[PDB]
């Protein structure tokens, strides 16, 4: 079973950026969805984006346009690229590796990492 570790958590002005990557110990090329979500203190746990095996991703509304996930399967990584970032913005940030139950892999997988601190201030 994999196991995830997030990195690249800081604070940053609003307006600016940063990368979050998600380092996991083995392959996660055949793992259904990798996805970043994040939660705030006194909020839900939101899922932000995420990226399918094929490699087809996906991206909650309000980050649509200056958030990008991408993968690097020869690095078992699975990065969040975060532009123009808002206060809003601000929350641990938290990966997760999902695949349901199935033929090939009756065990279903449902990991997460312990996340990375993003503060969106000044």
């Known amino acids: 079973e994999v196991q995830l570790v997030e990195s690249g958590g800081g604070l940053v002005q609003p307006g600016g950026s940063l990368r979050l990557s998600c380092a996991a110990s083995?392959?996660?090329?055949?793992?259904?969805?990798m996805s970043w979500y994040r939660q705030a203190p006194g909020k839900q746990r939101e899922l932000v984006a995420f990226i399918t095996d094929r490699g087809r991703t996906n991206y909650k509304v309000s980050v649509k346009g200056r958030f990008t996930i991408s993968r690097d399967n020869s690095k078992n990584m699975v990065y969040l690229q975060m532009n123009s970032l808002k206060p809003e913005d601000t929350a641990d940030y938290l990966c997760?590796?999902?695949?349901?139950?199935?033929?090939?892999?009756?065990?279903?997988?449902?990991?997460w990492g312990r996340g990375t601190q993003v503060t969106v201030s000044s």
């Open positions: 083995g392959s996660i090329s055949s793992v259904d969805v």
């Open positions: 997760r590796a999902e695949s349901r139950t199935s033929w090939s892999s009756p065990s279903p997988l449902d990991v």
